[PDB]
Structure formats: structure tokens, C-alpha cells
Amino acid sequence: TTNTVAAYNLTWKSTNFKTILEWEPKPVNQVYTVQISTKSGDWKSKCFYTTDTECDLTDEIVKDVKQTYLARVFSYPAGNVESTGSAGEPLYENSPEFTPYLETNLGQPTIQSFEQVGTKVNVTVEDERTLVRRNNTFLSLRDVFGKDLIYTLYYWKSSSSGKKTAKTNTNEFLIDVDKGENYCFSVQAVIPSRTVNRKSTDSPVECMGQE
Amino acid sequence: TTNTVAAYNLTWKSTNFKTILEWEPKPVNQVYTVQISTKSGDWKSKCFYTTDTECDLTDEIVKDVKQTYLARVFSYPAGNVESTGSAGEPLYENSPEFTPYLETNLGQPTIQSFEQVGTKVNVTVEDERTLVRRNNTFLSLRDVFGKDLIYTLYYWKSSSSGKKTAKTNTNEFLIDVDKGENYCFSVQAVIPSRTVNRKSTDSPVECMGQE
């Protein structure tokens, strides 16, 4: 219209289900209103008449991480408008589709602790808490993906050659080490069943004699 | 509703037809939208989703200074709203009625010039330009009120006693002075036919030997 431009570059920013919709451009005499819906669903307004160029949609997508979502950003004129005729009203742009389950990014994992139990070392990776709520509790990464989530351990002797690997479908690894040694490990989460965004980044590395 | 309060103290600020609607309160997670209509007329939006606590309605009231106007201030939720249920929407408050012709304030007048033409002095008051538009020109105060506007001259000898008066229905006075003297004048506009807001404030005073 004569006082409004449609938003563009509607991109979804989601890591561990924390979901923000980002768009352009920084407004001038214009405010936005962001709406969300499951594909083919009712539309619901979340961020109202704001000058912000992003909207946190976590509270809604978390209602059912399996649903496919669609967002709509409206452009509204702001301030003392020309009057004369009448401000045209409601230009909006639809976001790309978002299936949180299949698309949220797996954040970088953290090794919680390792301990030597004989010739065996037990590596526990931290269970990350999410905002997915069920009953009166927040689900963890593991609680949400269940058997779909897998961890990979990379460990190598502080000295050399290659890194050996191990995988687990729980939050812990139990491995055989060359006794009385210094080993370093790092872990990476993976969702094998995904065609895209399958892996996370490696956790920082931890070593045996951390002193 | 659960996130919005209705505006209050809707007061009209108008001097020489420059008309601003002022209201309370300073918003928090809320924006306003101001609409105007002739009493019983169609509503038109002027200031959109703003955080401002005032709206300049001059461009509209000036369309017909004789009409009676009414303004409506809506309250709209702003920002990332609770979601959960649904933001209630549209609480609004109507302004008192405003008839510009009968109500705008007469601004302080300015004596443009005085000159001695014999035993006569001619005092000219400045014709104030307004935003009232007609064809391709801006009307002056005089052009709008015509015969309803009147000026009063107050003049007194620089020495003493009382101030004498004179009235005119044009922009100038022609008075008889005690020759070779020092006189001071001040002018005040008046619209006698008004029951309220009849007069303006006195213009600054000007004197004969301004040197």
C-alpha cells in the first residue's frame, strides 16, 4: 500500500526447540503482528503490533513438536498517517513450513562426568532440559526424542593417531581403556533417522587427568 | 481485558484551530489507535498503533470547522503476549464533543504596526494565518470568523490613569491622540457571540517612541 511494505526473509531459528521467527526489514512508520498456525490450522496471534524484527514462538510449537507450523507476519501502518483517503491496511507474508521434531537444531552437548570403574570408564552426557512441557514437568532432550537420539563418543589417547568411537542410545557410555592412562573424549548427538540436520556440534573435550 | 486498560482524560487542545487530542495513560505493553468522526458520522483512523499519548487531528477538523467532532481512542496489546487463551482485544474510549468554530482558543494577537497620520494613529493587528484551507490558500483568522471576530484596542498615555478602548471588525484601528505624545497599546481578540472562550489574551504592549 502507500505506507507499508511486506516483510521478507522469514527465517526460523530453532535450537533444542527454542523457536524464534526472524524477518526483514527494520520498520519505519510500521509495526508487525505475527500469527502462527499448524499447517491448515486456525491462526493465532503471538507478537502484537511491534517494531521488533523477531518473535519467540516457543510456547506454541512446544504444544506439539510433531505438528507442521506456518507463521504469518502482517504489516500495519504506525503513527500519524496522511489521512486524505484511507490507509490501505494488512499486507502479510507467510513463513516457510516448520516441523520442530524434524527440524530443530541439536545444541552442542556437554559431557557431565567420566569416572574410572576398573579397566572401564563411564562417560555420562548431560541431559539437556527443554521447554517442552508435559503435565507438570519440562521434558529433556532424551525424553522428547527417546530412541531417536544417539550419542557418539570420540576418545583417543592423549598421545596420538586416531580417535576411536562408541555410540549409545542412553546418556552414558562404558568403555575399555588401556589402564592407568590419559584419554580425552568429546561427544556429539545424532538423530540418524533425519535426512537433514542430523548432527550437533561436538561437545568441548574433557581429559582424564584434569588437574 | 487481561492486558489492556482503557484511555482516560481525553482532552482537546485547540488554539486557532490547531487541534490535538490528549489522553492518559502512558502505555505499557499497549499501543493506541485514534479515530475521529463528525457526531454521528463515519469513523476514520488518524494515529495508528502508537505509543504516543496525543494525536494531531488538525487536518480533519479543518475540513469543516462548523461540524461537531468526536474522537475514539482504542487500546491494543503490544508485544509478545501470554498466548495461552487469546488476547481479549479492542477496549476504546470516546472523547468529549468538539465544535472547533465555537471552541478553538483565540491565540494571543500581535500588533503589526502603528503609524501617526496627523492627530490620528492607525493601529494594525497582524492577521494570523490558519491551517484552514480553501481552494489553494490557507485562510487567516479573519477569513474564517469574518464579522464574528472583533478586536479591542487598549491605549493609554505613557503617563497615567486609565486605559481607553476602541473596537474594530477589521484588522485596524484609527484613533485620535493628544498630539506629539507617547501612547502605549495592546490588543485583544474577542468573539462576542460565544458563550464560552470569548476572548484571547492581550497582545504584548507597543509604545509610540519605541527607540
Side-chain angles (χ1 to χ4, degrees), chain A residues 18 22 26 70 82 92 97 122 140 155 160 173 187 196:
Chain A
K18 195 171 188 48
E22 272 186 350
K26 194 264 140 55
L70 211 28
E82 82 289 296
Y92 66 83
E97 303 186 324
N122 168 69
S140 73
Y155 59 107
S160 61
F173 299 86
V187 48
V196 180

Side-chain angles (χ1 to χ4, degrees), chain B residues 18-31:
Chain B
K18 195 171 188 48
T19 307
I20 316 282
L21 181 67
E22 272 186 350
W23 65 93
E24 270 160 26
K26 194 264 140 55
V28 293
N29 312 307
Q30 195 178 270
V31 295

Side-chain angles (χ1 to χ4, degrees), chain B residues 106 189-200:
Chain B
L106 297 165
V190 177
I191 294 189
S193 50
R194 275 177 173 194
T195 55
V196 180
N197 250 38
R198 311 175 78 249
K199 322 206 276 182
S200 83

